[PDB]
UniProtKB/Swiss-Prot annotation, chain A:
The chain holds residues 12 to 195 of 389 of the full protein. Keywords: Proteasome. Component of the 19S proteasome regulatory particle complex. The 26S proteasome consists of a 20S core particle (CP) and two 19S regulatory subunits (RP). The regulatory particle is made of a lid composed of 9 subunits including PSMD6, a base containing 6 ATPases and few additional components. This is 26S proteasome non-ATPase regulatory subunit 6. Belongs to the proteasome subunit S10 family. It comes from the Eukaryota. Component of the 26S proteasome, a multiprotein complex involved in the ATP-dependent degradation of ubiquitinated proteins. This complex plays a key role in the maintenance of protein homeostasis by removing misfolded or damaged proteins, which could impair cellular functions, and by removing proteins whose functions are no longer required. Therefore, the proteasome participates in numerous cellular processes, including cell cycle progression, apoptosis, or DNA damage repair. GO terms for biological process: proteasome-mediated ubiquitin-dependent protein catabolic process. The lineage of its organism: Eukaryota, Metazoa, Chordata, Craniata, Vertebrata. GO terms for cellular component: cytosol; extracellular region; ficolin-1-rich granule lumen; nucleoplasm; proteasome accessory complex; proteasome complex; proteasome regulatory particle; secretory granule lumen.
From Swiss-Prot, chain B:
Component of the 19S proteasome regulatory particle complex. The 26S proteasome consists of a 20S core particle (CP) and two 19S regulatory subunits (RP). The regulatory particle is made of a lid composed of 9 subunits, a base containing 6 ATPases including PSMC5 and few additional components. Component of a complex with USP49 and RUVBL1. Interacts with PRPF19. Interacts with TRIM5. Interacts with NDC80. Interacts with PAAF1. Interacts, in vitro, with the thyroid hormone receptor (in a thyroid hormone T3-dependent manner) and with retinoid X receptor (RXR). Interacts with ERCC6. It is found in: Cytoplasm; Nucleus. This is 26S proteasome regulatory subunit 8. Component of the 26S proteasome, a multiprotein complex involved in the ATP-dependent degradation of ubiquitinated proteins. This complex plays a key role in the maintenance of protein homeostasis by removing misfolded or damaged proteins, which could impair cellular functions, and by removing proteins whose functions are no longer required. Therefore, the proteasome participates in numerous cellular processes, including cell cycle progression, apoptosis, or DNA damage repair. Belongs to the AAA ATPase family.
Swiss-Prot record, chain C:
Component of the 19S proteasome regulatory particle complex. The 26S proteasome consists of a 20S core particle (CP) and two 19S regulatory subunits (RP). The regulatory particle is made of a lid composed of 9 subunits, a base containing 6 ATPases including PSMC4 and few additional components. Interacts with NR1I3. Interacts with PAAF1. Interacts with TRIM5. Interacts with ZFAND1. It comes from Homo sapiens. Belongs to the AAA ATPase family. Transmembrane segments: none annotated. This is 26S proteasome regulatory subunit 6B. Component of the 26S proteasome, a multiprotein complex involved in the ATP-dependent degradation of ubiquitinated proteins. This complex plays a key role in the maintenance of protein homeostasis by removing misfolded or damaged proteins, which could impair cellular functions, and by removing proteins whose functions are no longer required. Therefore, the proteasome participates in numerous cellular processes, including cell cycle progression, apoptosis, or DNA damage repair. It comes from the Eukaryota. It is found in: Cytoplasm; Nucleus.
Protein backbone atom coordinates (compact mmCIF):
# COMPACT_ATOMS: atom_id res chain seq x y z
CA UNK A 1 0.00 0.00 0.00
CA UNK A 2 0.96 3.65 -0.42
CA UNK A 3 0.13 4.63 3.16
CA UNK A 4 3.57 3.87 4.79
CA UNK A 5 5.21 4.84 1.52
CA UNK A 6 6.51 8.35 2.32
CA UNK A 7 8.83 7.23 5.13
CA UNK A 8 10.72 5.24 2.49
CA UNK A 9 11.48 8.45 0.56
CA UNK A 10 12.69 10.12 3.77
CA UNK A 11 14.98 7.19 4.53
CA UNK A 12 16.41 7.26 1.00
CA UNK A 13 17.36 10.85 1.80
CA UNK A 14 18.65 9.59 5.15
CA UNK A 15 20.76 7.01 3.28
CA UNK A 16 22.63 8.96 0.61
CA UNK A 17 23.10 12.60 1.51
CA UNK A 18 24.54 12.41 5.05
CA UNK A 19 27.75 10.86 3.82
CA UNK A 20 29.19 9.57 7.09
CA UNK A 21 25.67 8.70 8.29
CA UNK A 22 25.13 5.81 5.89
CA UNK A 23 25.45 2.74 8.11
CA UNK A 24 22.23 2.47 10.14
CA UNK A 25 20.23 3.95 7.26
CA UNK A 26 21.28 1.18 4.86
CA UNK A 27 20.34 -1.38 7.52
CA UNK A 28 16.88 -0.24 8.61
CA UNK A 29 15.82 0.43 5.02
CA UNK A 30 17.04 -3.02 3.99
CA UNK A 31 15.02 -4.17 7.02
CA UNK A 32 12.05 -2.93 4.94
CA UNK A 33 13.45 -3.21 1.39
CA UNK A 34 13.84 -6.98 1.04
CA UNK A 35 10.54 -7.55 2.79
CA UNK A 36 7.03 -6.50 1.75
CA UNK A 37 7.86 -7.54 -1.82
CA UNK A 38 9.72 -4.37 -2.89
CA UNK A 39 11.71 -5.08 -6.05
CA UNK A 40 12.15 -2.03 -8.29
CA UNK A 41 12.98 1.14 -6.25
CA UNK A 42 16.36 0.12 -4.80
CA UNK A 43 18.70 -1.07 -7.58
CA UNK A 44 20.60 2.22 -7.75
CA UNK A 45 20.18 2.54 -3.99
CA UNK A 46 22.04 -0.77 -3.82
CA UNK A 47 24.56 0.88 -6.15
CA UNK A 48 24.80 3.71 -3.63
CA UNK A 49 24.99 0.99 -0.96
CA UNK A 50 27.80 -1.53 -0.56
CA UNK A 51 28.23 -4.69 -2.65
CA UNK A 52 25.75 -7.01 -0.86
CA UNK A 53 27.07 -9.71 -3.14
CA UNK A 54 24.47 -12.44 -2.54
CA UNK A 55 21.14 -10.76 -3.22
CA UNK A 56 20.16 -13.18 -5.99
CA UNK A 57 18.15 -15.63 -3.89
CA UNK A 58 17.05 -12.60 -1.88
CA UNK A 59 15.52 -11.32 -5.12
CA UNK A 60 14.31 -14.72 -6.35
CA UNK A 61 12.27 -15.43 -3.20
CA UNK A 62 10.54 -12.05 -3.73
CA UNK A 63 10.04 -11.86 -7.50
CA UNK A 64 8.39 -15.26 -7.11
CA UNK A 65 6.04 -13.82 -4.48
CA UNK A 66 5.55 -10.88 -6.82
CA UNK A 67 4.47 -13.38 -9.48
CA UNK A 68 2.32 -15.24 -6.92
CA UNK A 69 0.17 -12.17 -6.32
CA UNK A 70 0.35 -11.50 -10.06
CA UNK A 71 -0.78 -14.99 -11.07
CA UNK A 72 -3.75 -15.04 -8.71
CA UNK A 73 -4.77 -11.87 -10.51
CA UNK A 74 -4.28 -14.03 -13.60
CA UNK A 75 -6.59 -16.57 -11.91
CA UNK A 76 -9.10 -13.84 -10.96
CA UNK A 77 -9.59 -12.21 -14.37
CA UNK A 78 -11.50 -15.13 -15.88
CA UNK A 79 -13.71 -15.93 -12.87
CA UNK A 80 -14.81 -12.30 -12.57
CA UNK A 81 -15.84 -11.97 -16.23
CA UNK A 82 -17.83 -15.22 -16.31
CA UNK A 83 -20.48 -14.02 -13.84
CA UNK A 84 -19.86 -10.30 -13.82
CA UNK A 85 -20.17 -7.79 -11.04
CA UNK A 86 -19.12 -4.20 -11.76
CA UNK A 87 -16.17 -5.40 -13.87
CA UNK A 88 -14.69 -7.34 -10.99
CA UNK A 89 -11.38 -8.00 -12.79
CA UNK A 90 -10.64 -4.27 -12.67
CA UNK A 91 -12.57 -3.93 -9.40
CA UNK A 92 -10.31 -6.52 -7.78
CA UNK A 93 -7.07 -4.96 -8.97
CA UNK A 94 -8.30 -1.41 -8.53
CA UNK A 95 -7.24 -2.14 -4.95
CA UNK A 96 -4.40 -4.50 -5.93
CA UNK A 97 -2.72 -2.18 -8.41
CA UNK A 98 -1.75 0.04 -5.46
CA UNK A 99 0.13 -3.02 -4.30
CA UNK A 100 1.63 -3.15 -7.81
CA UNK A 101 2.17 0.61 -7.48
CA UNK A 102 4.31 -0.06 -4.42
CA UNK A 103 5.82 -3.26 -5.76
CA UNK A 104 6.32 -2.46 -9.42
CA UNK A 105 6.97 1.00 -10.76
CA UNK A 106 4.46 3.57 -12.01
CA UNK A 107 3.73 1.77 -15.30
CA UNK A 108 1.70 -1.03 -13.74
CA UNK A 109 0.00 1.65 -11.67
CA UNK A 110 -0.70 4.20 -14.41
CA UNK A 111 -2.18 1.77 -16.93
CA UNK A 112 -4.37 0.23 -14.24
CA UNK A 113 -5.47 3.44 -12.54
CA UNK A 114 -6.53 5.04 -15.81
CA UNK A 115 -8.19 1.71 -16.53
CA UNK A 116 -10.26 1.77 -13.34
CA UNK A 117 -10.86 5.52 -13.55
CA UNK A 118 -13.50 4.93 -16.23
CA UNK A 119 -15.07 2.04 -14.31
CA UNK A 120 -16.59 3.74 -11.26
CA UNK A 121 -19.42 6.12 -12.14
CA UNK A 122 -19.06 7.91 -8.79
CA UNK A 123 -16.06 10.03 -7.88
CA UNK A 124 -15.83 8.42 -4.43
CA UNK A 125 -13.51 5.84 -5.88
CA UNK A 126 -12.16 8.11 -8.64
CA UNK A 127 -11.03 10.87 -6.30
CA UNK A 128 -9.31 8.29 -4.10
CA UNK A 129 -7.44 7.02 -7.16
CA UNK A 130 -6.28 10.59 -7.82
CA UNK A 131 -4.73 10.75 -4.33
CA UNK A 132 -2.63 7.74 -5.32
CA UNK A 133 -1.37 9.47 -8.46
CA UNK A 134 -0.47 12.53 -6.39
CA UNK A 135 1.50 10.48 -3.91
CA UNK A 136 3.67 8.57 -6.39
CA UNK A 137 4.22 11.86 -8.27
CA UNK A 138 5.90 13.17 -5.12
CA UNK A 139 8.19 10.13 -4.86
CA UNK A 140 9.36 10.42 -8.46
CA UNK A 141 8.94 14.25 -8.12
CA UNK A 142 6.63 14.31 -11.17
CA UNK A 143 6.25 18.08 -11.08
CA UNK A 144 4.48 18.08 -14.45
CA UNK A 145 2.10 15.22 -13.69
CA UNK A 146 0.96 16.69 -10.39
CA UNK A 147 -0.18 19.83 -12.23
CA UNK A 148 -2.55 17.72 -14.32
CA UNK A 149 -4.36 15.64 -11.70
CA UNK A 150 -4.53 18.37 -9.02
CA UNK A 151 -6.88 20.28 -11.30
CA UNK A 152 -8.49 16.93 -12.07
CA UNK A 153 -8.74 16.39 -8.33
CA UNK A 154 -10.18 19.84 -7.58
CA UNK A 155 -12.68 19.54 -10.44
CA UNK A 156 -14.25 16.61 -8.56
CA UNK A 157 -14.75 18.16 -5.11
CA UNK A 158 -17.25 20.89 -6.20
CA UNK A 159 -20.03 18.37 -6.62
CA UNK A 160 -20.53 17.18 -3.08
CA UNK A 161 -18.69 18.79 -0.20
CA UNK A 162 -15.85 16.28 0.06
CA UNK A 163 -14.10 17.90 2.97
CA UNK A 164 -12.30 14.70 3.85
CA UNK A 165 -11.15 14.99 0.23
CA UNK A 166 -10.61 18.75 0.34
CA UNK A 167 -8.92 19.21 3.72
CA UNK A 168 -6.94 16.10 2.88
CA UNK A 169 -6.04 17.71 -0.46
CA UNK A 170 -4.90 20.99 1.11
CA UNK A 171 -2.08 19.17 2.88
CA UNK A 172 -0.78 17.92 -0.46
CA UNK A 173 -0.36 21.39 -1.97
CA UNK A 174 0.80 22.46 1.48
CA UNK A 175 3.59 19.95 1.16
CA UNK A 176 4.06 20.82 -2.49
CA UNK A 177 4.18 24.59 -2.00
CA UNK A 178 6.86 24.03 0.64
CA UNK A 179 8.62 21.57 -1.67
CA UNK A 180 8.99 24.52 -4.03
CA UNK A 181 10.15 27.77 -2.37
CA UNK A 182 6.66 29.24 -2.04
CA UNK A 183 6.11 30.03 1.61
CA UNK A 184 3.19 32.46 1.46
CA UNK B 1 -46.01 -18.22 -4.36
CA UNK B 2 -45.46 -18.27 -8.10
CA UNK B 3 -46.17 -14.55 -8.38
CA UNK B 4 -43.32 -12.75 -6.59
CA UNK B 5 -39.84 -14.02 -7.32
CA UNK B 6 -37.97 -12.78 -4.24
CA UNK B 7 -38.94 -10.66 -1.26
CA UNK B 8 -36.22 -8.64 0.48
CA UNK B 9 -36.55 -7.39 4.05
CA UNK B 10 -34.95 -4.12 5.15
CA UNK B 11 -34.33 -4.04 8.90
CA UNK B 12 -33.62 -0.93 10.93
CA UNK B 13 -29.86 -0.41 11.20
CA UNK B 14 -27.71 -1.50 14.12
CA UNK B 15 -24.64 0.05 15.76
CA UNK B 16 -22.25 -1.05 13.02
CA UNK B 17 -24.69 0.18 10.38
CA UNK B 18 -25.46 3.50 12.00
CA UNK B 19 -21.76 4.33 11.88
CA UNK B 20 -21.17 4.10 8.15
CA UNK B 21 -24.35 5.96 7.29
CA UNK B 22 -22.86 8.71 9.45
CA UNK B 23 -19.55 8.13 7.69
CA UNK B 24 -21.01 8.69 4.24
CA UNK B 25 -23.05 11.74 5.20
CA UNK B 26 -20.24 13.39 7.16
CA UNK B 27 -18.23 13.46 3.94
CA UNK B 28 -19.72 16.74 2.72
CA UNK B 29 -19.48 18.50 6.10
CA UNK B 30 -16.48 20.57 7.17
CA UNK B 31 -15.49 18.65 10.30
CA UNK B 32 -13.16 19.22 13.23
CA UNK B 33 -10.48 16.67 14.11
CA UNK B 34 -11.42 14.68 17.19
CA UNK B 35 -15.04 13.66 16.94
CA UNK B 36 -15.46 9.95 17.79
CA UNK B 37 -18.46 9.27 15.55
CA UNK B 38 -18.83 5.89 17.30
CA UNK B 39 -20.11 7.68 20.41
CA UNK B 40 -22.56 9.64 18.28
CA UNK B 41 -24.00 6.54 16.60
CA UNK B 42 -24.66 4.80 19.91
CA UNK B 43 -26.87 7.65 21.12
CA UNK B 44 -29.40 6.85 18.40
CA UNK B 45 -30.89 3.42 19.24
CA UNK B 46 -31.62 2.59 15.62
CA UNK B 47 -33.97 5.29 14.38
CA UNK B 48 -33.57 4.76 10.60
CA UNK B 49 -31.29 5.75 7.76
CA UNK B 50 -33.34 8.93 7.37
CA UNK C 1 -33.66 44.10 -30.97
CA UNK C 2 -33.25 42.93 -27.38
CA UNK C 3 -35.22 44.44 -24.52
CA UNK C 4 -34.98 45.24 -20.85
CA UNK C 5 -37.12 42.81 -18.83
CA UNK C 6 -40.75 43.50 -18.15
CA UNK C 7 -43.89 42.14 -16.48
CA UNK C 8 -47.37 43.30 -15.47
CA UNK C 9 -48.10 41.01 -12.54
CA UNK C 10 -46.91 42.08 -10.19
CA UNK C 11 -44.46 44.87 -10.77
CA UNK C 12 -41.94 45.09 -7.90
CA UNK C 13 -43.67 46.14 -4.62
CA UNK C 14 -43.17 49.92 -5.07
CA UNK C 15 -41.46 50.18 -1.63
CA UNK C 16 -42.95 53.49 -0.46
CA UNK C 17 -46.60 52.91 0.36
CA UNK C 18 -46.40 49.15 -0.09
CA UNK C 19 -44.92 47.72 3.09
CA UNK C 20 -47.74 46.47 5.33
CA UNK C 21 -45.84 47.98 8.34
CA UNK C 22 -46.08 45.08 10.78
CA UNK C 23 -42.96 44.50 12.84
CA UNK C 24 -41.56 41.36 14.45
CA UNK C 25 -42.62 42.57 17.89
CA UNK C 26 -46.29 42.50 16.87
CA UNK C 27 -46.38 38.72 16.31
CA UNK C 28 -46.47 37.40 19.87
CA UNK C 29 -45.41 33.89 20.73
CA UNK C 30 -44.04 32.23 17.60
CA UNK C 31 -40.52 31.60 18.80
CA UNK C 32 -39.74 28.50 16.73
CA UNK C 33 -41.24 29.72 13.50
CA UNK C 34 -39.93 33.28 13.67
CA UNK C 35 -36.47 31.83 14.22
CA UNK C 36 -36.71 29.07 11.64
CA UNK C 37 -38.07 31.21 8.82
CA UNK C 38 -34.96 33.33 9.29
CA UNK C 39 -32.62 30.43 8.54
CA UNK C 40 -34.45 29.58 5.32
CA UNK C 41 -35.21 32.99 3.81
CA UNK C 42 -32.97 35.92 4.73
CA UNK C 43 -30.02 34.44 6.57
CA UNK C 44 -28.85 32.63 3.39
CA UNK C 45 -29.73 35.82 1.52
CA UNK C 46 -27.09 37.86 3.36
CA UNK C 47 -24.68 35.33 4.91
CA UNK C 48 -24.44 33.25 1.76
CA UNK C 49 -20.79 32.33 2.23
CA UNK C 50 -21.07 30.27 5.43
CA UNK C 51 -23.53 27.91 3.74
CA UNK C 52 -20.96 27.71 0.95
CA UNK C 53 -18.15 27.26 3.46
CA UNK C 54 -19.71 24.54 5.58
CA UNK C 55 -21.45 23.02 2.56
CA UNK C 56 -24.98 22.34 3.78
CA UNK C 57 -27.05 23.16 0.62
CA UNK C 58 -29.39 26.06 1.56
CA UNK C 59 -33.07 25.41 0.83
CA UNK C 60 -34.50 26.56 -2.47
CA UNK C 61 -38.11 27.09 -1.45
CA UNK C 62 -40.25 26.76 1.62
CA UNK C 63 -43.85 25.61 2.10
CA UNK C 64 -45.72 26.95 5.11
CA UNK C 65 -49.13 25.60 6.02
CA UNK C 66 -51.57 24.94 8.83
CA UNK C 67 -55.09 25.71 10.01
CA UNK C 68 -56.52 29.12 9.07
CA UNK C 69 -55.72 32.01 11.35
Amino acid sequence: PKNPDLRIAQLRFLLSLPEHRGDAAVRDELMAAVRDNNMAPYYEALCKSLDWQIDVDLLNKMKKANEDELKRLDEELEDAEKNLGESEIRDAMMAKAEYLCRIGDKEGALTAFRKTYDKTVALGHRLDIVFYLLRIGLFYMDNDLITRNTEKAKSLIEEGGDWDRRNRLKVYQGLYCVAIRDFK
Amino acid sequence: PGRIDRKIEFPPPNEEARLDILKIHSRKMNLTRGINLRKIAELMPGASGA
Amino acid sequence: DVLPPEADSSIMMLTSDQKPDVMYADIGGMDIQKQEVREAVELPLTHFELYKQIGIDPPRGVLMYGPPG
